[PDB]
Amino acid sequence: QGPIWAKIPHTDGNFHPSPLMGGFGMKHPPPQILIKNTPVPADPPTAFNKDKLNSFITQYS
Amino acid sequence: ENVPFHSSYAHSQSLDRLMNPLIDQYLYYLSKTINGSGQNQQTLKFSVAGPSNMAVQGRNYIPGPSYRQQRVSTTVTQNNNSEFAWPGASSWALNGRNSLMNPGPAMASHKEGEDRFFPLSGSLIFITNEEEIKTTNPVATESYGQVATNHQSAQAQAQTGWVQNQGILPGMVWQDRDVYLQGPIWAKIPHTDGNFHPSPLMGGFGMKH
Known about the structure:
With about 60 residues, chain A is mostly loops.
């Protein structure tokens, strides 16, 4: 049930970098993988308005 | 020799209308200096320059230079009852001798809507009118604009003054004078250490040869 790896903080020095909760310490661990839904706006007004759009289509993937 | 193509068109846009009429600027101007009704009401209020007020918007370019001409009406009743042909004219002095300014820097002969007025020495008389260039050029019979003449203060009100002649500024654009069928074609550029925009003032193509 426990963790696998940790990232070794980027520092001048460290000793026995193996992480204290267990697992393999690494300076370049597996990268983070970031994901989001691209916002799809609702219908904008017919006259121009400079504000950012706060009205979006409810959505998930 | 190589010379720029004489322009033979009239601009369909004025220098002060180049904006998009539907959209605001992101720039502000100073709308109000007083709350009102006197007695120590002083403030600074700012507003967005936009379609409702197009005079106060910021602009990247300004109209060309001016040297004012006296305005003369084709209707004789309107003109003053005196001899002003030489006395009231615009001139330039050289070595103690006065030359009339003719035709002068290229300027619009008259405002839009007044066709009965012409610059005293402004146009080529074979009486031509330059009104086509009123888009980028000031009117010959008008001031260039206004400038402040003082530092205002709680004691002193703001004072302006009329700019009768204006030389070149950075960011000016202008049109040269138009060429006519009967008119001149080319001129020789004088041989000098310096010149600016050598195009001749009676119209046509300036050339060092």
